Amino acid sequence: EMVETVCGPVPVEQLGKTLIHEHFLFGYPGFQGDVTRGTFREDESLRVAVEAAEKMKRHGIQTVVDPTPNDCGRNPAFLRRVAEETGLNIICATGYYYPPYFQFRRLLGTAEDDIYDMFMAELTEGIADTGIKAGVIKLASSKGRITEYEKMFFRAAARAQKETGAVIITHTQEGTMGPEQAAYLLEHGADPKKIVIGHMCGNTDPDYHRKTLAYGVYIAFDCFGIQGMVGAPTDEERVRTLLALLRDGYEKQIMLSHDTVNVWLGRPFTLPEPFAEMMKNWHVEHLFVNIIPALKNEGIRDEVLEQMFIGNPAALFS
Amino acid sequence: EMVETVCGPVPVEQLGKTLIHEHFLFGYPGFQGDVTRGTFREDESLRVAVEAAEKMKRHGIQTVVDPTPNDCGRNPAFLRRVAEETGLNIICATGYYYPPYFQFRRLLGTAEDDIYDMFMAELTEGIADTGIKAGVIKLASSKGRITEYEKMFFRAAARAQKETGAVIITHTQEGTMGPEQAAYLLEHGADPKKIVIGHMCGNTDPDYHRKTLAYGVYIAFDCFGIQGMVGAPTDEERVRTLLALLRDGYEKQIMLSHDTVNVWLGRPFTLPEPFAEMMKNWHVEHLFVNIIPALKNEGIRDEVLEQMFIGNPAALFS
Numbered sequence: 001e002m003v004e005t006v007c008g009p010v011p012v013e014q015l016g017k018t019l020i021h022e023h024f025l026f027g028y029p030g031f032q033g034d035v036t037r038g039t040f041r042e043d044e045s046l047r048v049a050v051e052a053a054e055k056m057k058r059h060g061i062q063t064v065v066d067p068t069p070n071d072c073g074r075n076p077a078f079l080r081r082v083a084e085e086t087g088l089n090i091i092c093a094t095g096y097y098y099p100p101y102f103q104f105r106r107l108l109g110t111a112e113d114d115i116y117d118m119f120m121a122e123l124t125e126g127i128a129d130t131g132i133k134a135g136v137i138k139l140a141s142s143k144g145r146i147t148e149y150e151k152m153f154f155r156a157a158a159r160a161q162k163e164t165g166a167v168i169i170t171h172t173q174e175g176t177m178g179p180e181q182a183a184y185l186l187e188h189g190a191d192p193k194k195i196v197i198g199h200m201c202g203n204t205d206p207d208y209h210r211k212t213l214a215y216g217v218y219i220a221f222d223c224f225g226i227q228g229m230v231g232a233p234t235d236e237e238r239v240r241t242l243l244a245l246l247r248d249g250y251e252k253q254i255m256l257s258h259d260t261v262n263v264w265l266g267r268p269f270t271l272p273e274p275f276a277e278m279m280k281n282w283h284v285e286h287l288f289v290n291i292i293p294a295l296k297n298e299g300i301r302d303e304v305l306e307q308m309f310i311g312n313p314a315a316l317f318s
Numbered sequence: 319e320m321v322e323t324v325c326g327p328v329p330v331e332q333l334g335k336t337l338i339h340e341h342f343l344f345g346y347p348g349f350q351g352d353v354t355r356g357t358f359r360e361d362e363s364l365r366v367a368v369e370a371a372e373k374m375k376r377h378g379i380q381t382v383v384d385p386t387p388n389d390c391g392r393n394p395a396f397l398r399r400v401a402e403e404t405g406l407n408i409i410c411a412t413g414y415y416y417p418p419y420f421q422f423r424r425l426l427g428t429a430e431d432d433i434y435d436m437f438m439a440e441l442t443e444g445i446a447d448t449g450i451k452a453g454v455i456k457l458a459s460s461k462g463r464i465t466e467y468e469k470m471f472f473r474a475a476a477r478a479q480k481e482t483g484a485v486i487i488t489h490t491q492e493g494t495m496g497p498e499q500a501a502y503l504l505e506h507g508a509d510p511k512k513i514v515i516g517h518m519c520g521n522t523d524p525d526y527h528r529k530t531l532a533y534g535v536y537i538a539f540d541c542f543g544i545q546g547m548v549g550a551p552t553d554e555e556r557v558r559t560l561l562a563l564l565r566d567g568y569e570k571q572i573m574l575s576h577d578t579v580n581v582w583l584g585r586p587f588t589l590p591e592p593f594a595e596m597m598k599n600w601h602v603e604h605l606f607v608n609i610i611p612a613l614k615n616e617g618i619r620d621e622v623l624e625q626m627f628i629g630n631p632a633a634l635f636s
């Protein structure tokens with residue numbers, strides 16, 4: 001029926017065309033310390049975020065899930081301003097990126113309960129004093145492992161999902177741990193119909209995808225546009241992989257996005273001369289002007305695309 | 319001549335009796351993410367910080383070095399309020415605790431320059447828009463190692479010290495790397511007369527201390543009151559060690575403090591009852607009502623104590 005957005009409860013029927021994974025603001029944990037040279041320019045960031053929203057609206061997007069973690073500059077009030085100005089639905093997350101603070105609490109033996117309590121509060125009561133509730137729990141694991149630290153969050157997320165029916169979205173690191181994340185979550189009673197394993201496009205082996213899909217979870221090809229960096233494949237490989245799975249009939253378990261960061265938090269930077277060119281399609285319009293027209297050429301029917309962009313998000317949050 | 323405090327430049331002659339290492343506010347990196355259940359209560363925190371300052375003033379303290387790192391809740395404007403209200407001099411730090419943010423910048427190959435640039439800005443221009451400059455560069459290393467990540471900060475700090483004459487204060491982890499920190503800093507042109515190697519009381523072997531002292535640096539017995547937790551020694555061992563070094567004549571290189579955290583940032587907690595009892599002397603008055611009266615019994619002369627509390631800080635910042 002209803003999902004919490006940065007503008008309060010919204011009927012899932014009205015979510016419409018959805019991008020399952022984009023960031024209006026993002027900073028790598030640690031940016032906080034670089035406040036002097038990497039100060040947050042609120043009004044310019046708002047202008048940029050609002051233009052990103054208008055770009056997405058031009059291609060029919062009505063809803064964005066922004067899964068920025070608590071420690072990566074999540075700013076629900078900022079997100080509400082963007083939404084209030086543009087009419088875009090924005091759903092935010094509760095969760096942490098893939099350290100000493102929650103490690104200290106392990107010593108006291110309250111860490112997993114504290115995390116669960118954080119999740120419950122932010123899902124059912126509100127984030128700080130913003131009055132905004134998260135619509136998803138965000139989880140992440142490391143390359144090649146889900147560490148003991150990370151598993152605490154997975155267990156807490158599974159507990160919170162069982163009490164709230166909240167959606168879980170994950171981050172996989174460099175094409176690893178897709179099946180493991182699914183299996184561990186289900187072990188702990190999470191519902192596969194409410195789980196999205198993310199960054200599945202980071203792996204070019206279709207059998208890796210099918211092992212993950214076999215759990216009945218959603219997977220996301222949510223890094224379209226990212227090429228060269230963080231071990232990334234290329235967009236062609238992503239499309240090849242995606243094209244193999246839809247032909248196998250997996251369209252009811254697959255969503256697409258770019259994982260853009262429209263405003264970087266912390267100090268500005270510049271990607272070097274070869275990298276920057278390769279990364280030039282990393283923007284919120286890329287799926288619509290390049291990828292989807294290519295899926296058209298290979299013969300993907302519009303009813304399938306609508307399943308991924310409309311039906312799947314609608315079923316997920318239902 | 320002058321040192322920057324949270325109230326602007328102050329003649330070093332006027333610093334008087336000094337605690338080299340205490341925290342008005344502190345949170346473990348990651349506390350930022352736990353905003354919903356661990357919200358910062360500004361007015362109550364100010365009341366508590368001000369009472370800590372008044373406690374220190376009662377025993378004659380006129381100056382406190384608060385080396386809270388950038389990512390541990392450093393709040394210079396908050397510190398200036400405490401000082402403005404109490405007349406206490408407070409000197410703050412620029413630095414990071416002992417990660418993905420500065421790791422990302424390693425990839426771009428600008429990380430060490432960026433850190434140096436942060437240090438220069440905060441030492442010579444001001445922290446954010448507070449108008450407050452740090453008086454010390456704060457460094458930290460891990461247990462048993464100074465990592466490649468940490469060395470970047472050490473190299474940057476050494477460069478910044480050579481341009482500014484700024485004081486460096488370090489954190490050693492569980493009684494390790496004292497001599498290594500000193501040697502690596504000096505390799506890179508840092509001045510030993512402007513370096514304090516901290517938490518030296520975390521090691522009970524006097525020869526470890528003497529290897530560190532041999533570099534001509536200051537060392538700090540700055541964890542008085544911390545007992546039972548994180549592989550710590552007891553206060554008696556600290557005193558035993560300290561008593562051995564002053565008799566060897568090291569008083570011109572030694573400072574004392576408690577490393578208190580008077581207001582914890584993030585979610586509140588309680589210590590288990592056994593831990594709890596052992597930690598009960600971890601407060602800003604402990605040195606004055608317990609430790610120093612014991613050093614009196616063992617025959618330490620007042621002129622020696624004044625060297626540590628007055629002469630040493632004065633020479634350090636000179």
Ligand SMILES: [Fe+3]
Binds near residue numbers: 067
């Ligand atoms: Fe993301």
Ligand SMILES: [Fe+3]
Binds near residue numbers: 339341385577
């Ligand atoms: Fe400290």
Ligand SMILES: [O-]
Binds near residue numbers: 171259
């Ligand atoms: O991401």
Ligand SMILES: [O-]
Binds near residue numbers: 489577
């Ligand atoms: O500390």
Ligand SMILES: [Zn+2]
Binds near residue numbers: 170171172198199
């Ligand atoms: Zn991610």
Ligand SMILES: [Zn+2]
Binds near residue numbers: 488489490516517
């Ligand atoms: Zn320390």
